[model samples]
Target: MSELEKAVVALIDVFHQYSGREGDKHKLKKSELKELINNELSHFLEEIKEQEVVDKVMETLDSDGDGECDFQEFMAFVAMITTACHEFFE
Candidate 1:
């Protein structure tokens, strides 16, 4: 995978980690999501400061019908992010 692909994977993994397990799969609490972005994905989502945006992203990308984004949805989300970045950058 390319660097961008890896970045997407990392992003997905970070989201997955923040997403709690089965029977408790809810959109992460604001604090947990904040920790995921601020601590774990600091280098990735460093410029993203708006909590509202994060919440929106989570709500839109969580495709498993679950309250949180699952692995597949996260991967799809990563691809979308990469494509959007490419469009903007290139």
Candidate 2:
């Protein structure tokens, strides 16, 4: 695969690596999402140090009000961050 294609696959795999941990294999509960951000995306995100901040972040990401982030919701977040990163580089 091309480097960019590999990156796409890696991104999806990273999500699964966290989302598969507990509760639901296909969705990220609040804790899973928090860990993903704090661990994997920490360079892009601030430390996410407080429970209320996590709640607010989850609230913004949980567009369907299901209290979990499905793949689509997670991708939306990835896209937003990717866009910001790209803009910074450009």
Candidate 3:
């Protein structure tokens, strides 16, 4: 993958890699949520498993699904968080 393309590919790659571990094989369940952050996003994000705080984060990340986060919601999370960080620093 090229420079710009690599990012998008990585997003998709990471999404399914963990998503495929269990359940629907597509939607990212809560269990996989902690896995992704600890394994992949540890440096940037903390493993926020503070009971209701985790649920709150899930609530925002979830766009349409009942309790799972899908590809669309995943990318939206990526973009939104990235934007949030950028704004804070800028």
Candidate 4:
């Protein structure tokens, strides 16, 4: 696999790593998502200062209204962040 291909797989792997930490190994609860952001994406999200921000983020990503972030929803979040970074660099 190419570097980009490996990176894609890594994205999936990383999400699962965090998602599996608590209930519903396949989805991310607010707490799981919170830890993932603070630990992995602090560079982008910056310490996740408040519970309200985490609540809003989960609300925005939980498109199905299930109160948790599934793999697809998390991917969408990653894509949005990647796109923003691309635009900034471009």
- C-alpha lDDT of all candidate models, in order: 0.64, 0.93, 0.84, 0.94
Q: Please identify which of the two predictions, 1 or 3, would achieve the higher lDDT against the true structure.
A: 3
lDDT by residue (11-85, candidate 4, tens digit) is 999899999999999999999999999999978867887999999999999999999999999999999999998
In candidate 3, position 70 carries an lDDT of: 93
Badly placed stretches (over 4 Å) of model 1 are 1-52
What ordering of candidates by lDDT runs from best to worst? 4, 2, 3, 1
Best-matching candidate per lDDT = 4
* Candidate 3 wrong stretches, greater than 4 Å: none
Give the runs in model 2 whose Cα sits over 4 Å from its true position.
Answer: none
Tell me the number of clashing residue pairs for each predicted model.
0, 0, 0, 0
Candidate 4, which ten residues in sequence have the lowest lDDT sum? 42-51
Candidates in order, TM-scores: namely: 0.50, 0.93, 0.86, 0.95
lDDT of 4 at 66: 98
> How far in Å is the alpha carbon of 76 misplaced in model 2?
0.2
Estimate the TM-score for candidate 4. 0.95
Q: After aligning candidate 2 to the native by TM-score, how far in Å is the CA of 23 from where it should be?
A: 0.5
Ranked by TM-score from best down, the candidates are 4, 2, 3, 1
Candidate 2 lDDT by residue in tens digits, 59-78: 99998999999999999998
